[PDB]
Amino acid sequence: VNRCIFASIVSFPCSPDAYHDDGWFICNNHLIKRFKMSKMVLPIFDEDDNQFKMTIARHLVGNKERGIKRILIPSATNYQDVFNLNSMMQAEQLIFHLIYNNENAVNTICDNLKYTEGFTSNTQRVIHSVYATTKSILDTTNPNTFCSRVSRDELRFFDVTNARALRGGAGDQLFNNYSGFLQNLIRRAVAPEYLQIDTEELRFRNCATCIIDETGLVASVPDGPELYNPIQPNRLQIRNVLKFEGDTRELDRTLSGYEEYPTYVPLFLGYQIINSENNFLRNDFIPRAN
Amino acid sequence: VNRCIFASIVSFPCSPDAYHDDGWFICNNHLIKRFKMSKMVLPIFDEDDNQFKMTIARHLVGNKERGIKRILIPSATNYQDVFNLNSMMQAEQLIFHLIYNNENAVNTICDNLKYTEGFTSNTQRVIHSVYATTKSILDTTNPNTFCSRVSRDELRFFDVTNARALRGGAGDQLFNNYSGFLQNLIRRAVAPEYLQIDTEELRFRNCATCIIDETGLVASVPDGPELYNPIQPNRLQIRNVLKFEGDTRELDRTLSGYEEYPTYVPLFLGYQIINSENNFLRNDFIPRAN
Amino acid sequence: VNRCIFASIVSFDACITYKSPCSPDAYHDDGWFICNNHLIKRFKMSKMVLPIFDEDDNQFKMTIARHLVGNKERGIKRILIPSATNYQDVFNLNSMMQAEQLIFHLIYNNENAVNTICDNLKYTEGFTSNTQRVIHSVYATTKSILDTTNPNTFCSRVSRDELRFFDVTNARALRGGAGDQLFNNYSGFLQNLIRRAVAPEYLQIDTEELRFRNCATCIIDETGLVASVPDGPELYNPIQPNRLQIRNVLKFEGDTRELDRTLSGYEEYPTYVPLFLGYQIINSENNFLRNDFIPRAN
Amino acid sequence: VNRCIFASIVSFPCSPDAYHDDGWFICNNHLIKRFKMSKMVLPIFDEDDNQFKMTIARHLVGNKERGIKRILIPSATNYQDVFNLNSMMQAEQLIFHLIYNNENAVNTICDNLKYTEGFTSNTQRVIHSVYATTKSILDTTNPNTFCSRVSRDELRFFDVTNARALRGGAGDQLFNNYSGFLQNLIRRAVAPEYLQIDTEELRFRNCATCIIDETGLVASVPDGPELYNPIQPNRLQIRNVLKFEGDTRELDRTLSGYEEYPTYVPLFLGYQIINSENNFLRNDFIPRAN
Ligand SMILES: [Zn+2]
Ligand SMILES: [Zn+2]
Ligand SMILES: [Zn+2]
């Protein structure tokens, strides 16, 4: 079925994770390519050897990158600047306009293809098929659609200042302006700092690794320098690369046995309040509204 | 050769990684048993694939544990209260008193066992063998030895307020009161938040997971609730486990393919300033004092 | 013969036998008195030959060096051959071997440091046997190289046929400059190293000016032989086990296969940046054709 | 294919690089013979052993030449004086008038051939074959055509005073007036002093060996004396060569091993800007207009 938003890309690369019903509705290949994220899972173990897996993502922004280059999911206002849509294929640009609820851009995309001779020669069929698949996925991920199955069990607040009072701050207000698909992406990628299951409160990370502002979900720590994150044909791209000159064969030989702690930067931000009457363990992806 | 300080425990259990020349000079089994840490490695990757490994430890204290239960490596003042040395074997008490450079307790331990009938034969030899092994390990880890290969190469500060100015805080001056073995343990367990290799500064974690206090190495976050870390045959104990009640097989099957991000809480604290001229990649484990 | 100033390198302690990492080109009597590998290691350069063709095919070949420092390097890292004042700071002599410290302290004529070097080793028991001979052999080889290079030797082959100036403001009038007066402060070996490593902008064989390069790629300053351009950003120059040092490597992500295959048989212009600086007047009665090394003082 | 410009020369010798589609459209022999330049590759490297072949062109003007003898690519105004194109065969003169877009010269050439007895009998088939071939090659090099496969990702400014501000100057203003083929030749031959790929700027040579003025791309250096560059049948030459009378036959043996730095004067002038989106590594000869 290939439940990925960028699956319907054809002239007018999906990873095998698209077939899985994870709820992301995007594959890790496309996630890395577009939103500078790599999907992971957060095994929230119990004291007893029982567990439940919560989706998480690691941002792929380097330490030296600054400014717009640190934005993972831009807002609807500035998604044209971050993504450089004109470089992408017209199908990708149409899908991105749909994802960010840009009706005018979608209309312009449709209009510029009308002047083509072949638009009615099976090209309109392709455009409408891509649009229909993308809109079906969006409606699947949108709680506001007609007769939409929605879950009110989990309250997700991206501002922990007053989260325990069952209310959010400015960050959660900006989160509501997002589309349903982007809200789902941020909910899945950004695992909460605090997960309050019933009365119990669990804290996974000391402080946030990302911030939501007018520029969207930004892969920047709230204070201080940014964390050290180590990471198209016929395109000349030049990147500054940190390199260690020393020989490290003997060090890896000595420290081989011990378990390795990843140097990735997982996306942690906000508060999650799972209600006592929750169905959080279902595997059907009922979209969640805060 | 079992290079574990607690491998000499004998009446008057070491993991296989003790034999490895990791530099901890303590096995993972004994680290878990005594200091509430499990040895790990931190693979520091380039922007290329070349990597070098640093040793870190993940503390095993719970969310609900408060007070002395959160101390990982207690100070010389309060290590008596934290460890409850009476329960463990007298050889273990001798090793601990040698670790904390408490001469009066060592002398009392020697005096108490002098009155036994078997002290002269097959006991004093054992106590002196334990003493010699512990003292050799201490001298290996002590930079103030007669001819010690001390290293001014890496400047490891445990306070980042004035660390960039090559100064230290209160925690750093409290760190110097520790013995050679304890200083080596804290260096090999408490990873640096920042690793300023030459001019380049690499921030490994946004916030510190532990703080050095008057009570010792405390596994307490600087602010907010403590992080969620889920973890004597005849002794009766109560754990108050936080059981998770629900069916998670379906969810675990759904999210199987994706890489698992560990839920462990590692020890990140302080600032490491590696000098331009360094011999970091050696595996000889020279004391490496500040 | 291995006429490399660092070919005398050896571990003073006889327990460790340290072979000299010396390039095969050191045995040549070119006049560098330093091997390619040692000039790559210290005094960051690569020994090159600059063939100055005549108008016809017959040619005479000069020696020049290309500084290996990068674009991003600033401050001390820019200096290739430091001045005698700050050569200790630039080189970090503590990390180097004792033979290297001795050679470098002799190169800059720092007698106090050399006396200190032998004072530190005078205390050990092994100094009397199998180490005094080693230190004296290193000193003798370095002193012989310096004296061969020194124009102030007892009977030196000092040659005034070719005049080499390092300031071009008034070099046509055979007058020196601030950089040249700083150049005279260097010892003989450093002067020859700079002369063989730096080529003039305006060669002036007889009265025939021969401008090698438009603008200088190096400047002699108070800090030393600086690999810094006179103005603007620095030139783009692409470029010890158990040591962990950052690199900041710049990487190209393109395919480059089709572009490389496109231009197959076209002579490749090098990207190397050689040291061009000064004004080497040559007299009508010169003897530049000779192959025997000479100090070549002003 | 013989894509060279003067390949079609018959009455109304190219080095085997005419068949190669390197985008030059003129053989190295024909470049030397016509424009006093040469074909050489400038392999811009990086810290990693990788490269992309950008093309350079040494100029063949000697040290002592003055005035119009130093010009490599004269302007459309004074190409009659600089080139003495009349002396060449009428095919070469016609193709040169084609290159500089002089319709009066071309149709005067046509008028002269009309009165010949052979024009109506198998001569127009030659002159218009030459005209059509050369106009086709020019249009392939000309960016502004009906169907323009132009690339606007890169920007070339031959004036560096305000080049970093994405503007040009007098030199670039006089540069735009050139023909498509002439602009292509100046672009390919003259490598930029500064190559700003994305945000990182690379400087290859300190000073501009060639200066653009009204007389054309002049080999003269902007300051000081000219650089030292050592290099028609039945026409004896009053030619002056340099007198190096030394032996210089064993000194080469003393310096045979080392690598030889070429004494060729390359063609450096101006500042080239490349954006993040670029297709430089393609071999389709994007006309690359400004
Ligand atoms: Zn996909
Ligand atoms: Zn053990
Ligand atoms: Zn050598």
Residue numbers in the entry:
A (entry chain C), B (entry chain A), D (entry chain O): 15 to 26, 35 to 253, 262 to 320
C (entry chain M): 15 to 253, 262 to 320
Paste lines from the article.
To understand the provenance and biology of baculo-like viruses, we have determined the structure of the nucleocapsid in the intact BV of the prototypical baculovirus, Autographa californica multiple nucleopolyhedrovirus (AcMNPV). Using cryo–electron microscopy, we show that the nucleocapsid forms a covalently cross-linked helical tube protecting a highly compacted 134-kilobase pair DNA genome. The ends of the tube are sealed by the base and cap substructures, which share a 126-subunit hub but differ in components that promote actin tail–mediated propulsion and nuclear entry of the nucleocapsid, respectively. The nucleocapsid orchestrates key steps in the infection cycle including the packaging of the genome, membrane envelopment, actin tail–driven trafficking within the cells, and breach of the nuclear pore upon genome delivery.
The building blocks of the tube are flat, diamond-shaped dimers formed by two triangular MCP subunits. The fold of the MCP is novel and has no identifiable homolog in the Protein Data Bank (PDB) and AlphaFold databases of predicted structures. The MCP face exposed to the outside of the tube is composed of a helical domain and a four-stranded β sheet. Unexpectedly, each strand is held together through a small interdimer interface burying only 660 Å2. Similarly, interfaces between the nucleocapsid strands are relatively small but stabilized by a potential interstrand disulfide bond. The lasso forms an antiparallel β sheet interaction with the lasso from the next strand (right inset), whereas the zinc finger extensions from two neighboring subunits project toward another, burying only 483 Å2 but potentially locked-in by a disulfide bond between Cys29 residues (right inset). The baculovirus adopts a stabilization strategy analogous to the HK97 chain mail, which is based on an extensive network of intermolecular disulfide bonds that covalently cross-link the entire body of the nucleocapsid. The intrastrand cysteines are conserved across the viral family, whereas the interstrand cysteine pair is specific of alphabaculoviruses. Thus, the entire tube is a covalently interlinked container, which is expected to be extremely stable under oxidizing conditions. Thus, the MCP dimers form quasi-equivalent contacts in a manner analogous to icosahedral particles that follow the Caspar and Klug principles.
